[PDB]
């Protein structure tokens, strides 16, 4: 019932793929090559002229976070009540802010800004360590005691930063244990080790 | 006393949309103004989750992130669509608004002088998606999604209004958006609020540019 339309990279689709895989959902991948994209017709039919695009039956959605929220809403990964839902949103928005900075670094000035970015990293990750400490001592998920779409988004963000700055999580015990714990979930573990994930570049420009 | 408290700098900025929402929905709220002096002192910043404002309090629930605040209000006040499908569409609209808002903010604080012309030239292409959304919903006669107002409407309204200040007449080429702004701006409570000193006398941005 699901179709994700995207370029052949993990990018902004990694988190939603992990979510679908971990939740045991099936989906079809519609790969869009740079050639096809530069042709122009697909772009013109996209609401904001960008991908990913997602189809749930006849519902066509755009915007990665909208897709995540939609899945969180339909699959029950949006907290147990309104208070938790608000907290889940707060976590996801924080993830999105840092993701934008990451994306900017990767595509705008990797060479020149990498050092400053890595130096500033600890300050950027602290908020998530704090959130974790306030939720049952970081023994469960980011919000509440059930997994939410924010968890998958945060997991991806942490994983790609471990590739960018190996060991950046060493100074954060809760985050470190969190990544290990989530990465150990049966279906997610199988997915993260599959060619489907491993053989796709993280970003489109060969930088990471 | 009011259950809501918005903590922010004395500017409209990322709080304009939520204020319009509260006002239009007849809600009461307390404004906790943070001056640049107080902020540079450091203690408040250190207590903020991501080291930034706005901050929002609903009873003992302290929230950060403007869009989280909007979604929370949309969820508790019933401004999030009539069902899941609409909720997804509302999110899609809001995310689009957020993307353009970031570009606007970047222009305003990063290089207003140098980039203003290019930005205004690219504007029509950026607004088209919203005109399209409007055309697909009862011919743009009601709201952005469905037939009931959502938090996305307030966010979009603010975005359109601030762009009308940046590039006067930018909405002329978009009949649906133009009528939409006029229609929403005419709602009783919202109209009263937009004309109040509380709104009018607050600068749009913090650096005096708009
Ligand atoms: C080519 C391989 C690298 C691909 C990089 C990732 S896609 C980047 C871009 N899409 C976005 O930035 C999506 C942003 C949107 N806010 C979301 O979160 O979904 C796009 O479609 N860009 C195409 C365009 O704008 O023309
Ligand atoms: C001073 C008058 C001008 C104020 C401009 C608007 S506040 C800007 C900034 N906050 C944000 O950018 C908030 C972004 C956040 N993602 C959201 O959506 O709420 C901040 O708190 N910055 C303070 C800091 O980072 O130290």
From Swiss-Prot, chain B:
It is an enzyme of class 2 (transferase). Its EC number is 2.5.1.18. One of its GO terms (molecular function) is JUN kinase binding. Changing residue 105 to V: In allele GSTP1*B and allele GSTP1*C. The modification N6-acetyllysine is found at residue 128. It catalyses: RX + glutathione = an S-substituted glutathione + a halide anion + H(+); prostaglandin J2 + glutathione = prostaglandin J2-S-(R)-glutathione; prostaglandin J2 + glutathione = prostaglandin J2-S-(S)-glutathione; prostaglandin A2 + glutathione = prostaglandin A2-S-(S)-glutathione. Homodimer. Interacts with CDK5. This is Glutathione S-transferase P. It comes from Homo sapiens (Human).
């Amino acid at each position: 019932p699901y179709t994700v339309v995207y370029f052949p990279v993990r990018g902004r689709c990694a988190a939603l793929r992990m979510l679908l895989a971990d939740q045991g959902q099936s989906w079809k991948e519609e790969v869009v090559t740079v050639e096809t994209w530069q042709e122009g017709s697909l772009k013109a039919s996209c609401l904001y002229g960008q991908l990913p695009a997602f189809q749930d039956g006849d519902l066509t959605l755009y915007q990665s976070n909208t897709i995540l929220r939609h899945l969180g809403r339909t699959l029950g990964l949006y907290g147990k009540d309104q208070q938790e839902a608000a907290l889940v949103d707060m976590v996801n928005d924080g993830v999105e802010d840092l993701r934008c900075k990451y994306i900017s670094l990767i595509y705008t000035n990797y060479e020149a800004g990498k050092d400053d970015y890595v130096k500033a990293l600890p300050g950027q990750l602290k908020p998530f360590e704090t959130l974790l400490s306030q939720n049952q001592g970081g023994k469960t998920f980011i919000v509440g005691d059930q997994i939410s779409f924010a968890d998958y988004n945060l997991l991806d963000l942490l994983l790609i930063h471990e590739v960018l700055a190996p060991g950046c999580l060493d100074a954060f015990p809760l985050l470190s244990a969190y990544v290990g714990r989530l990465s150990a979930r049966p279906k997610l573990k199988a997915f993260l080790a599959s060619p489907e994930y491993v053989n796709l570049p993280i970003n489109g420009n060969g930088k990471q």
